[PDB]
Amino acid sequence: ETLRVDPTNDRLSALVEIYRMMRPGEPPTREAAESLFENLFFSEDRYDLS
Amino acid sequence: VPLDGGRFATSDLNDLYRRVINRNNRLKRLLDLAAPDIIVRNEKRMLQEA
Amino acid sequence: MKTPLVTREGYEKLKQELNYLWREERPEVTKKVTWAASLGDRSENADYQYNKKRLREIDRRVRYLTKCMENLKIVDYSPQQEGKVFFGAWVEIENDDGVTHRFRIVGYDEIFGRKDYISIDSPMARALLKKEVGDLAVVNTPAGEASWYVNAIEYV
Amino acid sequence: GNRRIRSVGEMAENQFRVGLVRVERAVKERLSLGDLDTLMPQDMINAKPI
DNA sequence: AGTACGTCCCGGAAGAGATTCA
DNA sequence: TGAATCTCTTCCAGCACACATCGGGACGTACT
RNA sequence: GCGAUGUGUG
């Protein structure tokens, strides 16, 4: 039922919606949002558990 | 407030007025020089926010 | 210190320069900034680094130019005070050893090597508040006492 | 079992790390303009933020 | 030499979406 | 079509003490 | 001769 409620149906527009919740207003950009979501759970820099 | 020293623990009101005045003065100096519209917009925006 | 009077030629030149800066350079600067922001938005983008540095520099230069244009005042004396190298004349001083200068008293902003090399800032010119055709302008330069016999003064 | 105790050690470590991530920014900045060896690291480092 | 002086900056509750019996 | 039922987001959380620290940095210079 | 934060008192 969640997947039913989903508005989007691809990696592209998925990342789009994510970037849209993160930085409101600003227009999207494919590789921009790509790198963004890459820079939230998958890099030494801005995320870490000890 | 003259603190004991060569400084002054300025009240926030002072600094605020100060910012406003700098902003208004740059705006004044711009208009007479017909600087471009993007600049004057950024100017007015900073002013409103100030 | 910094004499708030500058040449009218310098004023016109700096005005045209700031016009060209805020009218031409800033637009392409912002365009390059946006193009770097296109999917870059990172701390590794050398393009974005150069763009931001140039943006800060352009901002500082524009602020300084606007301040000099408004607060200061222009001064370009005519040859009415000819001979008088107080202002408005490319005056020259010879030396006994070959230190021959030939410049005009210009402000501390439009300092270059396109018309002269003089400035109202150093005492070596501050002692020259109003010169003549035979003034023995001597001073204690930064590495010893220097001197120059005024050999020519005229405007153009 | 889910609360955790830090100590001066952890505090210093973490905050000192924040200091180094402060400095590294300008570090890499000035490295960008890097010229041939006429400099030394202390030229491209500033303790003052740390 | 190195700087004191320059600028530069959890509960509530009510509104605007926004959703659903028509 | 339109009156109900969610849902972001502004506003307030006791009184009176006592004492304590701390309050710009940064960037750039005409000199000191 | 101000404000922040903390500590303690009832």
Side-chain angles (χ1 to χ4, degrees), chain B residues 29 33 36 39:
Chain B
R29 187 176 67 192
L33 278 72
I39 292 173

Side-chain angles (χ1 to χ4, degrees), chain A residues 23 29-32 35 46, chain C residues 37 40:
Chain A
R23 292 180 180 177
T29 298
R30 183 178 65 83
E31 295 180 353
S35 296
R46 288 179 176 87

Side-chain angles (χ1 to χ4, degrees), chain D residues 22-35:
Chain D
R22 292 287 181 87
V23 64
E24 63 182 359
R25 189 175 182 180
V27 171
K28 191 176 289 184
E29 180 66 26
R30 187 174 295 276
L31 180 59
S32 175
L33 281 73
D35 59 2

